[PDB]
């Protein structure tokens, strides 16, 4: 009925905000570019999604052999695990803020709690989606209010000139850069769209002029990604206007935002706590939906590469568990350190953006053969190659 959808994923949340607590308005440009890129990529897969009656996974299978198949399957599994780790940490932090339970108990609750999603499914969709949409929209209103006196030409002229010296030299910059990119693309979204397009009442083969569906779907996808771009830009400039030009250059993870909202002077006293807990709720809900979307993606991947299948609850459970193991390892090793956990989170995102090319290459290749093809694949070519140079340099400086 009414509009309801969740666009903020803790990955992009932390990455964008961090990018505004440390370096300022510099990163802004990168965001745009990444967003634009994803648009194009969506387009591509959707074309592949609608013709050739296959899924990107099946595609990969039809250009490989058994072993390298195992390899790319490992890679896709690792991408999914990365996203799930991001999510579970998001949920754990949300719980620790709202209630007070320590992190380990929250992590365990999250991992073996998927029964909530069968319960609430038996409960009713429209209401829950409406209410979460309301709360997210309101949280975003709050952030907008919170942004204050600012100098536009700064943001602008830093968006534009793209100080390459800057964007490449600070190897702290490449880090959050790759973070933003790999959190704006999210390969699991690629596989999932490739599959989901396969069902829109197009006359599967008996309409050579089904491309009307292509145009409609691409329009939808572009609208979606555009609004995601606006949200990311907002979060970044928020981190900027709330932590920049200061002493000790506090990192700017989640906790710091949660406090800065509370102790915020001009917001009175109680309103601090009000917005605080609202933010907490938002974090939690975003985590959960980001989980639920990717289960189908994992299923599709395994069905494609190994040509095997499992019921969903087993899939979700085992993935979540193998995801939560690194969380607990890091917690016990580092005895609990918000700084250390948020650092793990960002490293997860950047690892996602490292894995991307192994799933980007075959997409381009396959769209170079069949009946429908892009005229200027050259954009994707330059994209992947510049990409490879960046990732290998960031690897090297280690």
């Amino acid at each position, epitope marked *: 009925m009414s509009v309801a959808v969740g666009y903020m994923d803790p990955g992009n949340w932390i990455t964008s905000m961090q990018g505004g607590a440390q370096y300022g308005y510099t990163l802004l440009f990168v965001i745009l570019i990444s967003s634009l890129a994803a648009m194009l990529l969506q387009s591509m897969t959707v074309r592949l999604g609608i013709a050739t009656g296959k899924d990107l996974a099946q595609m990969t299978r039809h250009f490989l052999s058994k072993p390298v198949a195992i390899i790319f399957w490992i890679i896709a599994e690792l991408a999914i695990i990365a996203t799930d780790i991001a999510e579970v940490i998001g949920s754990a932090i949300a719980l620790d803020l709202i209630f*007070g339970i320590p992190l380990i108990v929250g992590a365990l609750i999250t991992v073996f709690d998927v029964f909530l999603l069968l319960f609430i499914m038996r409960f009713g969709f429209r209401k829950i989606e409406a209410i979460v949409g309301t709360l997210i929209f309101t949280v975003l209103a709050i952030f907008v209010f919170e942004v204050f006196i600012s100098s536009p030409q700064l943001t602008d002229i830093l968006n534009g000139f793209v100080p390459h010296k800057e964007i490449v030299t600070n190897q702290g910059i490449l880090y959050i850069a790759l973070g933003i990119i790999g959190a704006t693309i999210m390969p699991h979204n690629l596989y999932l769209h490739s599959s989901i397009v396969q069902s829109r009442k197009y006359d599967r083969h008996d309409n050579q002029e089904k491309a009307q569906a292509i145009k409609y779907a691409t329009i939808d996808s572009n609208l979606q990604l555009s609004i995601a771009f606006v949200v990311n830009c907002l979060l970044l400039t928020l981190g900027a206007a709330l932590f920049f030009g*200061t002493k000790t250059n506090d990192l700017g993870g989640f*906790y*710091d935002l949660y406090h800065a909202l*509370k*102790t915020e*002077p001009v917001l009175g006293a109680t309103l*601090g706590g009000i917005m605080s807990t609202l933010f907490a709720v938002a974090l939690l809900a975003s985590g959960q939906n980001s989980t639920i979307t990717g289960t189908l993606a994992g299923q599709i991947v395994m069905e494609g590469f190994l040509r095997l299948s499992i019921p969903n609850w087993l899939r979700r459970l085992i993935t979540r568990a193998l995801a939560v193991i690194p969380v607990i390892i890091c917690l016990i090793i580092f005895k609990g*350190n918000s*700084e250390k956990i948020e650092q793990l989170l960002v490293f997860s995102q950047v690892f996602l953006s490292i894995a991307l090319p192994f799933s980007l290459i075959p997409l381009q290749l396959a769209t170079s053969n069949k009946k429908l093809m892009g005229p200027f694949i050259n954009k994707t070519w330059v994209n992947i190659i510049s990409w490879t140079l960046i990732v290998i340099l960031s690897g090297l400086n280690v």
Partner: nanobody
Amino acid sequence: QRQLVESGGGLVQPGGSLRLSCAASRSIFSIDTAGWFRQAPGKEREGVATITRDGNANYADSVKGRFTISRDRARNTVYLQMNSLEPEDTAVYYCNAAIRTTVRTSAQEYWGKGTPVTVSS
């Protein structure tokens, strides 16, 4: 120097354990650097531990093995868990801090009032 409130001291047999908790009075943004001092009744204010901005947990040279400082970045509260206590650790345990009220105001010191801790049969 007020607006900090330690709490948790109490009688304890030799070899017991307990967790003192420096705190804040109202809605404090962050605790830069803590420190727990001791002022046993016939000596000078010694000093027992020191966390830093991120984490350093530097200790004294007579306590490593029993005292585990920590922080709680969620509800700003330094902790101090003493384990396997001894009859030579009786004293009042002050708390130091480096409170910073809001995200842009400079730092500012603060001392506590401290709490007693007795160890005996």
